[PDB]
Amino acid sequence: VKQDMPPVGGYGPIDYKRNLPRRGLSGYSMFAVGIGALLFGYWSMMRWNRERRRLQIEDFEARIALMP
């Protein structure tokens, strides 16, 4: 008997294509999330600067009233 090494019924194909799905975004999405979070941070720190100037004037009223 002969028992060499042939393939089995013809082998299936093996791919040759670049599986590169171009995992994407958009410039509109960049624009939206960047300007949104950025202006959110601007407004938040603006309001905190106003409350902190309230505190700062209070510290000045302390030092002026104590001084003589």
Partner: protein
């Protein structure tokens, strides 16, 4: 290979990348596409293996 048959290369089919203009990046792309076409040649060679003799 495709200009001079010195082995069973006449019975297999592929393509080989040629360079645009210089540019070592393009030489790298040439190497990668020769790799993938080598995989295609190995697939064809497993498709065409006769069990004759050693």
């Amino acid at each position: 290979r495709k200009t001079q048959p010195y082995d069973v290369y006449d019975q297999v089919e592929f393509d080989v990348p040629i360079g645009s203009r210089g540019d070592c990046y393009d030489r790298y792309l040439c190497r990668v596409e020769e790799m993938r076409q080598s995989i295609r040649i190995i697939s064809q060679c497993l498709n065409k293996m006769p069990p004759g003799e050693i």
